[PDB]
Design a protein around this ligand. Structure first.
Ligand SMILES: [Zn+2]
Ligand SMILES: [Zn+2]
Lengths: 106, 267
């Protein structure tokens, strides 16, 4: 209960036996700062324009797409994750994992 | 032998091209999709590229076996000192250059005696091959050498030199008395044939064409090489008009630097 304990090096060398068999497949870091949180500054405004916009895998479901995919998404504006619109499976689909973010992301 | 050692090159490249092309077949189908605006410009291109790469693999496989059909079939320390002499032959070709004969000559204006045995040594150098032709050197008149040449069963040619340079050349057939009644070589006469008199003009134009101010040996060598094409007379049709006879005349005129029988009208 509240350990604040650094795991021992005996675990570290056993985790160094991991690349003997297992290598890291991939990750998905959510906080892509597409919003203006990492673009503006007080007394330093940016005179924006419209439409200038100064490896593509779905953030919600784990279905890999192509380089320039085709399927459409609803814009989860709060964090930029691709809340993709039309799920591939509907006749056999989970009815809450899709419906929890049927509106927006958390 | 090197015919198999160079015919193996196409196959040893083709198998690696098969590996690369099947890798392309794998990853392009594995690349997913690149729409590039319209879908009809992509999904109709999907079957196009899927036919393209698979058919490239197929044609590579196919051209593999026609190459496979035609083909057939101190320990290492002193080996290193062997092939360097063989690459010295390439080193001889390193300093050759393609500039060759062509130069950038301007006007030659500012601001001799040689023995006839040298002429004999000149004529002995090229008579040693082409056994179908013969050379008979003679000087019954002065030190100038005029030569009798027989060409198989076809031509008898008198070739007069003077001052080690060219004087004259007259060609006749095979069944005429090229000598006179006295037995000396004839000097001033005519070939008494329309084709022969027509091609003597071509010979006169050719002798004024090969122009070396210092080196007449290559002039007369190119002249006799040009004459060597004339043992194919009455046997090869013309290269542009198809038929032999242009107004009853078979092709004779060999072009400069491109030896093939033509006419004056046929150029
Ligand atoms: Zn989100
Ligand atoms: Zn012709």
């Amino acid at each position: 209960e509240g350990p604040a304990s650094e795991p021992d090096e005996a675990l570290v060398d056993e985790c160094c036996l991991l690349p003997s068999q297992l290598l890291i497949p991939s990750l998905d870091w959510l906080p892509a700062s597409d919003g203006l949180v990492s673009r503006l500054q007080p007394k330093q405004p940016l005179r924006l324009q419209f439409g200038r916009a100064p490896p593509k895998i779905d953030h919600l479901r784990r279905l890999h797409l192509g380089a320039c995919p085709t399927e459409e998404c609803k814009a989860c504006t709060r964090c930029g994750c691709v809340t993709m619109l039309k799920s591939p499976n509907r006749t056999t689909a989970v009815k809450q994992w899709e419906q929890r973010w049927i509106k927006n992301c958390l | 032998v090197s015919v198999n050692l160079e015919a193996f090159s196409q196959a040893i490249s083709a198998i690696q091209a098969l590996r690369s092309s099947v890798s392309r077949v794998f990853d392009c189908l594995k690349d997913g999709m690149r729409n590039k605006e319209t879908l009809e410009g992509r999904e109709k291109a999907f079957i196009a590229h899927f036919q393209d790469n698979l058919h490239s693999v197929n044609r590579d496989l196919n051209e593999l076996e026609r190459l496979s059909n035609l083909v057939g079939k101190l320990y290492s320390q002193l080996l290193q000192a062997y092939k360097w002499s063989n690459k010295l032959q390439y080193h001889a070709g390193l300093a050759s250059g393609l500039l060759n004969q062509q130069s950038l000559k301007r006007s030659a204006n500012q601001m001799l005696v040689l023995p006839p045995q040298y002429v004999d040594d000149v004529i002995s150098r090229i008579d040693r091959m082409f056994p179908e032709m013969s050379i008979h050197l003679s000087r019954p008149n002065g030190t100038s050498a005029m030569l009798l040449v027989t060409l198989g069963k076809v031509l008898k040619v008198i070739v007069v030199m003077r001052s080690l340079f060219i004087d004259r050349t007259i060609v006749k057939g095979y069944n005429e008395n090229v000598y006179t009644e006295d037995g000396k070589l004839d000097i001033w006469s005519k070939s008494n044939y329309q084709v022969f008199q027509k091609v003597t003009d071509h010979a006169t134009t050719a002798l004024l064409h090969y122009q070396l101010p210092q080196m007449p040996d290559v002039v007369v060598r190119s002249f006799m090489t040009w004459l060597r094409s004339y043992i194919k007379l009455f046997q090869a049709p013309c290269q542009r008009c198809g038929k032999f006879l242009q107004d009853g005349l078979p092709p004779t005129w060999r072009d400069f630097r491109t030896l093939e029988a033509f006419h004056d009208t046929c150029r």
